[PDB]
Symmetry: C3
Subunit: 274 residues, 3 copies
């Protein structure tokens, strides 16, 4: 990986001057290799280590560079045409590979090459962008989007119309991360490297970014950037000092319980069979 | 229907042990028949009877079982491939059938087999899941989603990015129902068997589930699970006891009037011609 | 343009009696010409003149008439079929034209014919409807929608799941307009001819329509229908007179600054190369 990491970090510095025509064979083959590993799950943009999520910036750099080294090509849709430079992950798969890989892909769900999809996941019509990692047993419901380099844990349920922030535009320092066993309610959005800790339940229409106050009504504590494991979060507002208006905020109303669990469970019958 | 209802309710009990390989010819043919009837409108998951919506649980059971009896197959997209077990409703249609059926399907709108689409409807790019029923003159605007088994009335307008809850995952007791002549504003969501009574207008960004308080500012009455016919609903918040924060709620601000009607009308010129 | 404007305004009056069969060759060829010009950018539905946006109603009329003069046709998807009357903009393009045109179209992004897409734009999977105009350097992120006749400025960033109001259904007087250099946050919606003035930043989950109060906490001034240039807008609520509840509103919390700019920048490396 040093043999790759090196070439990669070298080119990034020259990013604005590289183009699909002036790029040297070395750098091209390397970025190519790195994208192929992300696509495999062999490498991943962010990892939890010693109980801390860490970002491998050189891997974000390679994702970025792929856009400088590759040229667009016409892609043939059936009733229309496309012109883009990132290949479709599943375009070369056959039943054997799909069977071997063990996930379900509902038309017209789409995934870019360079994204990792784990066994036993179900992708309803949705989008998974380059460099993302989607772990085992997770469902990505209709019109949801897993942003560039985003990290989705095992057994997570991303409801309909949910958006998980990328790192490409706007440019971001760290990917967005949703830990294991979380449920993200319909039309909610999690962006800007916010971390939703495991086993948490985010309600519908909840918008979390670095400037969002996650208010714990119990303790009076206000969080920023992260949702403490096992929380149930809903939309609310906090009043101005004069009380003349109030602004949006996320409110932790309680810890997940049986009652909550009743409404957010994963349906095993929909998962992979034997 | 007893000849079908019977086999169906028998297998459901053995749901976890059935698989596409061990399933007996009988049960397979039956589930198959039942799905074909839902697809026709001949049967429907929930029906209003004596002015009460009622759920036919055995029909929800068959929808569920279809996922145990059928195996995935590679579906050929143009630029990509899919692997799933529910056929595409329109894959076998020709102009004659489309002409005869009388609705409009805008690419890349997609509908699963087992869903009923009525005459004179317009599907912008969106998703309609198995077992759903969409009645006459309704428009499903861009990126909207009609969840599994959901019931949509006649002349309804589901705006852009609207989501109507399914019953598959999370698993639900009753489907979500939107009665006739309702207008659901952009990016709103209605889930968990909530019922929106006829002629109601839901504003943009309104999220309704069983735990959502639908507050009538006029009467002071708080509803749960249903929107009284002819209401105009918008987002709001209710203050904590200490007044230190407030939480999301839906507010009935008034009864539909000419003024309202001015903003939510169906455009007949877009509907079917002669 | 008078030779077209004339025929157009004549037919519109007879809109309900025209059909794909009874329509005269003249009116057909004209509507056809007018749609071809909108598609080219040669004509546009709304234009800023003397620092005021103005709507060319006759052009909205032609868009409307196209739905009366054209008949549906089966469109062949790969795994499914469609039945509609507005052709796909890119169906006839080849690499040369795409290269010449200079924008990027990510599968399965879709655009109707009669919509203008400018050089150096990037369309992630999304929808651009007939008569819309999307200016230079703009990005339309995943699942966003540019409504019928909507006007999007240069270098604008429409985030994921964003919806920009159309004028077809419900029927609208004026198109929705987003001026140059604006950033519209994830899952927000701008409809009903509201105008977002240049260089403004709309946060996530902000819903703006004619009845939305845009409250300036600094001045105490409440706007309706427009976002003053350079504002940063977020969701909030305003309290009832009795203080027994509060209702949704948009709050201008500040003027764009370096801090803001840090979170909303366009990524030039993603744009067109040389
Ligand atoms: C978060 C919930 C699970 C509710 O938590 P719960 O049921 O365990 O707890 P409750 O006791 O009901 O609520 C605790 C407090 O929170 C408040 N609360 C809970 N949920 C709330 C909500 N959504 N809005 C406002 N307040 C809420 C309660 O009013 C209560 O108030 P208080 O404690 O002060 O008296 C629920 O609100 C929710 O968000 N469910 C998820 C909905 C969802 O996303 N469903 C997916 C849609 N299904 C589909 O198939 C869609 C398909 C598609 O769109 O494509
Ligand atoms: C609900 C409305 C129709 C407004 O109701 P109305 O116009 O009949 O009533 P009003 O008199 O304006 O409002 C009554 C009260 O409700 C409040 N109110 C109304 N609408 C409100 C809103 N959206 N937000 C907050 N308050 C609102 C008013 O401020 C007023 O306050 P009060 O009475 O206390 O003084 C409107 O707000 C609305 O939601 N319209 C629907 C918007 C929509 O979904 N459009 C579809 C978008 N069009 C497209 O083409 C999108 C395309 C795509 O996304 O793909
Ligand atoms: C508007 C912001 C940029 C924040 O403005 P800022 O960072 O310049 O200013 P701040 O100093 O943080 O905020 C000023 C005031 O507004 C409040 N505020 C700011 N943003 C807020 C928000 N989102 N919610 C609530 N309050 C907010 C602050 O709390 C602060 O309060 P006060 O001044 O009274 O003390 C941010 O909130 C925001 O909306 N960012 C855009 C998020 C977004 O849409 N990202 C796109 C997602 N990225 C992807 O890749 C998605 C992919 C996909 O979905 O497909
Ligand atoms: N907000 C998105 C934009 C992706 C752009 C991808 C492309 O240009 O191909 C993200 O950061 O992931
Ligand atoms: N929330 C959605 C999930 C559908 C899953 C369909 C599938 O697995 O094929 C619903 O209940 O309708
Ligand atoms: N709300 C949308 C509906 C578009 C309908 C287009 C069609 O019928 O083909 C708009 O006004 O743009």
């Amino acid at each position: 990986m040093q043999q790759l990491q090196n070439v990669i970090e070298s080119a990034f510095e020259r990013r604005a001057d590289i183009t699909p025509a002036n790029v040297d064979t070395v750098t091209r083959e390397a970025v190519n290799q790195v994208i192929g590993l992300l696509d495999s799950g062999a490498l991943r943009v962010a990892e939890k280590i010693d109980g801390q999520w860490v970002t491998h910036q050189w891997l974000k750099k390679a994702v970025l560079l792929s856009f400088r080294i590759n040229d667009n090509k016409v892609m043939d849709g059936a009733e229309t045409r496309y012109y883009d430079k990132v290949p479709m992950k599943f375009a070369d798969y056959d039943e054997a590979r799909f069977q071997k890989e063990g996930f379900r892909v509902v038309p017209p769900a789409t995934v870019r090459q360079g994204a990792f999809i784990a066994r036993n996941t179900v992708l309803m019509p949705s989008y998974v962008n380059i460099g993302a990692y989607v772990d085992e047993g997770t469902m990505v419901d209709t019109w949801a989007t897993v942003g560039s380099c985003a990290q989705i844990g095992k057994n997570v349920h991303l409801s309909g119309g949910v958006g998980i922030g990328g790192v490409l535009e706007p440019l971001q320092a760290n990917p967005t991360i949703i830990e294991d066993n979380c449920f993200i309610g319909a039309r909610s959005e999690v962006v800007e490297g916010v971390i939703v800790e495991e086993g948490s339940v985010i309600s519908m229409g909840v918008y979390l970014g670095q400037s969002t106050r996650i208010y714990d009504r119990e303790t009076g504590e206000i969080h920023y950037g992260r949702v403490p494991a096992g929380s149930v979060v809903v939309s609310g507002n906090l009043p101005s000092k004069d009380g003349s208006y109030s602004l949006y905020c996320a409110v932790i109303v309680k810890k997940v319980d049986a009652k909550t669990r009743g409404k957010v469970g994963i349906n095993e019958l929909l998962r992979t069979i034997d």
